[PDB]
Write a protein that binds this ligand. Sequence first.
Ligand SMILES: C[SH](C)CC(O)(P(=O)(O)O)P(=O)(O)O
Ligand SMILES: C[SH](C)CC(O)(P(=O)(O)O)P(=O)(O)O
Ligand SMILES: [Mg+2]
Ligand SMILES: [Mg+2]
Ligand SMILES: [Mg+2]
Ligand SMILES: [Mg+2]
Ligand SMILES: [Mg+2]
Ligand SMILES: [Mg+2]
Lengths: 358, 359
Amino acid sequence: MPMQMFMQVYDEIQMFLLEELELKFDMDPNRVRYLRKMMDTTCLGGKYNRGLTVIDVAESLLSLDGARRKRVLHDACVCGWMIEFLQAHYLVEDDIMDNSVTRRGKPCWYRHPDVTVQCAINDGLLLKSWTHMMAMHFFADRPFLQDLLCRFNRVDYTTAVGQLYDVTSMFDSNKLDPDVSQPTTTDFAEFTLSNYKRIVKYKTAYYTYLLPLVMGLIVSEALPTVDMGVTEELAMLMGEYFQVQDDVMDCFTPPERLGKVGTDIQDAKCSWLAVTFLAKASSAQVAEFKANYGSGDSEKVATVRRLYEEADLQGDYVAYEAAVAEQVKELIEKLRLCSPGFAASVETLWGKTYKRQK
Amino acid sequence: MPMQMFMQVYDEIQMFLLEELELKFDMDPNRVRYLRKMMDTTCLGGKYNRGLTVIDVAESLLSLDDGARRKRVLHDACVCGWMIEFLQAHYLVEDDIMDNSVTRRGKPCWYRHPDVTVQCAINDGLLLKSWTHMMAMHFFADRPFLQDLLCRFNRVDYTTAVGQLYDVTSMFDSNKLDPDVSQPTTTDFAEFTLSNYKRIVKYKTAYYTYLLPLVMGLIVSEALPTVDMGVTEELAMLMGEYFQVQDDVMDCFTPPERLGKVGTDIQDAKCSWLAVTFLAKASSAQVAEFKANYGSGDSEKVATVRRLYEEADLQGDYVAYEAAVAEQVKELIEKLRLCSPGFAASVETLWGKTYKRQK
Ligand SMILES: C[SH](C)CC(O)(P(=O)(O)O)P(=O)(O)O
Ligand SMILES: C[SH](C)CC(O)(P(=O)(O)O)P(=O)(O)O
Ligand SMILES: [Mg+2]
Ligand SMILES: [Mg+2]
Ligand SMILES: [Mg+2]
Ligand SMILES: [Mg+2]
Ligand SMILES: [Mg+2]
Ligand SMILES: [Mg+2]
């Protein structure tokens, strides 16, 4: 049921936006068509975990006429797509930035035959603008609008900050200077777990876990009923774990199943595997890593991958996952004491995360 | 004085943003330093026409106090000024990447900086736009005009992005625009018409360069309903088109030394005012030679497009266009002045920064 109403609102949203461009922006049929495909290709096809979470939270809180349920669930759907569109925006720009080839089992947007890189960048910008346009259209007379948009913007900002941390993680920060060029790090002195946790917290945790929960709370007019300090603890913990999984899958999950080809090794990214390996590797292991990491060369890439499974990074992963699962469990109970309905939706959200195969 | 106050608020805004990143985003000194440099390089060095206009319109509508109101209105105007300047900074960063430009404001484009990777530049541009929202909320959280102000700011942001779409896809046959099928630059240039050009410029420049500064100035001095918006929009659109025509003409004929930026319009096969105007009057021979030289990085093929423009006396067309614009602007400003003398005066001042700008 959730999926069907969620998609119904997507058509409703798509109709409003496209018709508006046609009627108020003097847009031609050819560009309206291009934008429709852009929207479907960049916004659909994922797991919709962020969007569907808003709906489930809203529903879980609508008890603490029958029309209020309808308006609340519809508002939740719109918020769901605001987050999905926000991600679509970041994925379009992210793929360009990470030089990726595929996404969701298809070419990345900037990789489509008739999509130029220059237009792709702007297309990404349109995706973000659409989040504001839809919000203003549906939540015009809604009293929670300023707070809703205020939080949404803050999370948008946090994500951009995280992206900054991500794209500059492989360059000696002490030498970061706009006026002087610098090659990738060779000593990898900054590939630490501390630096890794910061990257992930900001680039993924906030928009993937905190935002969905928060928007679900707002449309249900129930944000002040929950322990926010515990909610953020959970959001951050789950988000970190989510990204660690994303990193692991990038290196070990076959594209066929993953839906995308990994670029972390080639992009010399400060991934969970990299920092974990480096912290435990011998000087010999580190030397070999240094002579193979950050290269497009298939064999060099293959060597890094082997260096990883010989340092038993899977054993570390299983131990990490267990540690997180334990903390999550505890935090969810603390949350359950005064916010049982909400703690339950958080449980369901963790159900879509713990040991996902994506 | 206008500038002095404007720069004081810049420092205040910068301090707020950078310190927040340090205290709430766990940012290190190195990256704080990078962002400070990114902000300065990206938001400073221009003419500040858009930002200074917000301040000037605001001050003019004031007469509609014991110092408190004036102090607040002018400061709000400065914040809005920077919101527009940061919004442009955002677009300029991305636009330079999109247009493969080399210099800007006399310096390398942001993404051309020795230590700025293209991938980071794209995101730095995103940060610039986010800052407009952060500063807005920080300073206007309690203002009654917050929602209306942000609603309008976001609409103009959206219109600008739509303009960019029109601009970047203007050299490709739209009938064949299809994500799944590659397609080369137009060879017949059938879409390089004045009609299509007016649409490109209206959305990509007119709204955020002329309408937004005025509208924001009115909002902060709380006098938005005191002006004939139909006339104000007509004026903004006309002045905006003209401004972009100047930008296109300068791209081709103003030496980079004075311009501060190297032109890329011909090499990029852009639907510029010069191209559309040339094609509409050119003989069949001129059109052939145009098609054989336009959209190439070859220094002699671009020099031929320049000579073609001079041969077709595009300066004669420009002078006439300029006069036609000046004529309407004057008549529109008079229509404004009848009901809004203070506002009409500030619009005159803006026109003065536009008309025959040497830029
Ligand atoms: C928007 S960012 C979280 C997207 C990724 O998770 P990345 O951080 O690893 O680049 P991706 O594997 O989907 O490219
Ligand atoms: C943001 S756009 C109006 C910037 C330009 O005016 P463009 O439209 O000609 O690319 P530019 O000459 O300053 O690059
Ligand atoms: Mg990526
Ligand atoms: Mg990335
Ligand atoms: Mg990844
Ligand atoms: Mg440009
Ligand atoms: Mg451009
Ligand atoms: Mg130009």
